From a paper:
In coumarin biosynthesis, a BAHD acyltransferase-family enzyme COSY was recently discovered to accelerate coumarin formation as the only known BAHD enzyme to catalyze an intramolecular acyl transfer reaction. To understand the mechanistic basis for the unconventional activity of COSY as a BAHD-family enzyme, we present several crystal structures of A. thaliana COSY (AtCOSY) in its apo and various ligand-bound forms.
To investigate the molecular basis for the unique catalytic activity of COSY, we first obtained the apo structure of AtCOSY at 1.9 Å resolution. Additionally, we observed a single Ca2+ ion that binds to the linker loop region and is coordinated by the main-chain carbonyl oxygens of Arg211 and Leu214 residues. Since we observed binding of a Ca2+ ion in the AtCOSY structure, we tested whether the coumarin synthase activity may be dependent upon Ca2+ or other divalent metals. We noticed a similar backbone fold and consistent positioning of most of the active-site-lining residues in these predicted structures compared to the solved apo-structure of AtCOSY.
Author numbering:
A (entry chain A): 2 to 50, 56 to 112, 122 to 451
B (entry chain B): 2 to 48, 56 to 409, 416 to 451
The structure:
């Protein structure tokens, strides 16, 4: 199957917002070395019948009046090498227009969004692609440098585009910058034990350059039935209540570390991102589209994770959220202020988890409805080379039987570990959870 | 205007990667006799000095890409090249000025103002082996500049060269380390099979003649010209082909067919002469297992469509477009392995695709814009080499600098006697007079 790039549109703001150049500063959350990555993902749309490309391009043009920094260039500052965003009149967001001879089925998927290096993504930190499928339907791909925004910030931007596409006269929320005012370090930096216990310094360590072999991607459908069984059996054995994220998180984390044959005394970490916009005092505004999340962690020696009961692991994950506070965030920022040059990292053995089940995927509607499927292609996230995603429920899941209902889990895992991991997921599917 | 050379810097790696000498083996893809050419390419930038920035980034890039500083020589057992690297080797950087503005010329996107050839070194045969990588920075009197490169095609393909230039550019932008570490391993990854075997796809394309020089044919002097083609006119052509044939063609297929026909027509190629449409495809991701990400050696193979000239010039464009489309069907792991094993079996026997080969290269959607040393991506890119793909008349699709005005550039190399008819063909194309049938 041949994907043909018909053209690349350089889409400028409808009305140029700048006189002369502006250099925007980024926050210490934005400048985290673990966010120096392009994040690549796509949305699949059902109907193709003006064209999706015409609608997306015109709406991008209008949105860029307020969101013009996405048209900018990331560069290192003159002083501390942290990134800033150079904005100037004439800059654009590239929209790649493509067409393939295929069916949405929802190797080749890699060609649906551009794949810049972290350094290349500095030059072009927001690239979109509209790919038309001959058989019906289309894909919106996005490659966004993670320093510019988190998922919530990208959702503000895309929702602004989408509401304009649906005929809004103006965007309903003015995007806020103010990044240094809102998330700048304290005058006397202070870093508490919860952040210090998590992070270490090593100028010689690249979290995304570890020699673990080729990282493979696989997808597993996990049934609601299986998860109800897991949670009920954990309750019967422990007296304790666990969420899907805690229980399935624990099972996958154990399986992966077991499958990788991690040394017994290696410290391993379960890491996830939490939105702190409303947690800060004072809170970040709704229109704050920069990174407004911090990583939270649970940590344990690998030998203990692989042989302790799942209810203990699930309880560690549950209890991780208790570190989430205004101070945790301030501590995290202050640590970046003190040690950005010193190679801040969470070490080897980090498994990142991202839960996309409970987000408003469906408001990103350009006229063809909400996406039928959403897929992240990136495998470098949260200081992990092996991140896991819980993907949203499809509409077919709510239309179908209870015993058919479930969601896909996308796993990134080193090739050598994948055979055993697949076996662990097959046992899961069979309800052979081996909980203790 | 007048171009003058101010000095020539010999840039060594910032830190010596070599204590001990080494001879690097090249692949059978690298040692293909059609790749015995210095590939010459220039990037134009509007605007410490560019020369300073380029020079330092080169020096740091050579820590990892030091074989570009080495010398090609023939091995002791066969006439195949190997690469001698040793401490002290350097990449020459030519520093130059020209006394006119980039603005005054087309940002070199119009006709040659008379010095375009002097913007990139043009090494002789022996010079290009001694110095298989040479750069040049030419400053224009109003501050803009051109980066020229002469790189021996045996060392790398376009994707390899792009790896290298992107390494220089990201270091110039203050990277703390390069994004992709380059991988050698050429012998192990792209060496021949112990029992060489060559399939019909490769055999049907290639022949043996120790007496034939694909780049020394007596066709007259080859000229270069450029044509702007609008996205509109391609849409029209594709819609007409679909209407008449029931087949959807890519731009490369449709425009490829049109240009190929027009060229063979204009050359008055004899009726029963076999003519070929040849292009290079990247096989890094096709191989089983795939080549690694930083494989910067040649990782492409030539694909072909062939047909008699008499049939090409009189059959419908849609038939020709289908021929080009169908040529991708040969692209497989075994096609590559067949190609490599043929080079093993017959390197000394003058492997060739014969007369009447027209090469096509589609460089529209390379990552041109990331080759940014701090003055932005290049405003104009220009290949000057015209000995490619066993053709003396290669054609490039290149990016250009409203929907009615949107498009790209076509750079054509064509013998002088055939240029006037070919010009009339591209004018008809521009007016939507495609004469398809
Ligand atoms: Ca610590
Ligand atoms: Ca033959």
């Amino acid at each position: 199957a041949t994907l043909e790039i018909t053209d690349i549109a350089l889409v400028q703001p409808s009305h140029q917002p700048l006189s002369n150049d502006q250099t925007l500063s980024l926050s210490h959350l934005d400048n985290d070395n673990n966010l120096h990555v392009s994040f690549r993902y796509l949305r699949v749309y059902s109907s193709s019948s003006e064209s999706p490309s015409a609608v997306v391009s015109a709406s991008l043009a209008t949105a860029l009046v307020h969101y013009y920094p996405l048209a900018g260039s990331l560069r290192r500052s003159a002083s501390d090498n942290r990134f800033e965003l150079l904005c100037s009149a004439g800059q654009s967001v590239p929209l790649v227009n493509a067409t393939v001879n295929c069916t949405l089925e929802s190797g080749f998927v890699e060609r649906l969004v551009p794949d810049p290096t972290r350094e290349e993504g500095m030059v072009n930190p927001c690239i979109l692609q509209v790919t038309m499928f001959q058989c019906g339907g289309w894909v919106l791909g996005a490659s966004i440098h993670h320093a510019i925004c988190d998922g919530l910030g990208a959702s503000l931007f895309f929702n602004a585009m989408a509401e304009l596409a649906r005929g809004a006269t103006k965007i309903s929320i003015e995007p806020v910058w103010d990044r240094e005012r809102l998330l700048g370090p304290r005058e006397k930096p202070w870093v508490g034990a919860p952040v210090r216990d998590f992070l270490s310094l090593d100028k010689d360590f690249d979290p995304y350059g570890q020699a673990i072999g080729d990282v493979k991607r696989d997808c597993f459908f996990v049934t609601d039935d299986s998860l109800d069984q897991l949670k009920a059996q954990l309750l019967e054995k422990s007296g304790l209540n666990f969420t899907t994220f805690e229980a399935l998180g624990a099972y996958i984390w154990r399986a992966k570390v077991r499958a990788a044959k991690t040394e017994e005394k290696e410290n391993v970490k379960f890491v996830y991102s939490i939105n702190i916009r409303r947690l800060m005092n004072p809170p970040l505004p709704k229109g704050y589209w920069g990174n407004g999340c911090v990583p939270m962690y649970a940590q344990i020696k690998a030998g203990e994770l692989i042989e302790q009961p799942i209810w203990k692991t699930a309880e560690l994950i549950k209890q991780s959220k208790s570190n989430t506070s205004d101070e945790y965030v301030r501590s995290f920022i202050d640590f970046q202020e003190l040690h950005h040059k010193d190679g801040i990292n969470a070490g080897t053995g980090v498994t990142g988890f991202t839960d996309w089940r409970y987000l408003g995927h469906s408001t990103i509607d350009f006229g063809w409805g909400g996406p039928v499927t959403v897929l992240p292609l990136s495998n470098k996230l949260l200081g992990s080379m092996e991140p896991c995603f819980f993907l949203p429920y499809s509409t077919d899941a709510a239309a179908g039987s209870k015993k058919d209902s479930g969601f896909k889990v996308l796993v990134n895992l080193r090739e050598s570990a994948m055979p055993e991991f697949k076996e662990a997921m097959d046992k899961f599917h069979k309800g052979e959870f081996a909980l203790s």
